[PDB]
Amino acid sequence: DEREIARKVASELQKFSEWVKKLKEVIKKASPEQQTKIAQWVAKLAGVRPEDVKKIIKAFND
C-alpha cells in the first residue's frame, strides 16, 4: 500500500530527524578532529561512508 508506506516513512523521518539534530549539537560542540571522529563512529556502526553521514545530516537541517 502506498499511503501506509508514506505514513510510516514520514513518521520515521520525524523521529530520525530528532537524532540528527542531537548528533549535530554534539558535532557543533566538538573540535574538527572530534567531528571527523564522530562521523567515523556513525559510519562504522551504520555501515556507511563518513561522507554519507554528512550528506544525511545536511538533508535534516532544512
Author numbering: 1 to 62
The authors write:
Here we describe a data-driven process for the high-speed, automated creation of stable protein designs. We describe a computationally efficient neural network, the Evaluator Model (EM), that is able to predict protein stability with high accuracy, based solely on amino acid sequence.
The design began with a requested secondary structure fed into the GM. The GM produced a primary sequence (nmt_0994) stochastically translated from that secondary structure; however, the Reverse GM correctly predicted that two of the requested helices were actually merged into one in the generated protein’s structure. EM-guided refinement then changed two residues to tryptophan, which raised the empirical stability score from -0.18 to 1.88. Five of the eight monomeric/oligomeric designs are highly thermostable; four do not unfold even at a temperature of 99°C. These four are precisely the non-aggregating proteins with stability score > 1, providing additional experimental validation to the previously published finding that stability scores are reasonably correlated with thermal stability. For one of these highly stable designs we obtained a crystal structure; this showed an all-helical structure, consistent with predictions of the Reverse GM, CD, and AlphaFold2. (C) Crystal structure for nmt_0994_guided_02 (dark grey), showing that it also has the three helices predicted by the Reverse GM for its pre-refinement progenitor. The prediction and the crystal structure have a CαRMSD of 3.4 Å. We found that one such model (trRosetta) could predict the crystal structure that we obtained for one of our designs with reasonable accuracy (CαRMSD of 3.7 Å), including correctly predicting the secondary structure and the relative orientation of secondary-structure elements, despite differences in finer details.
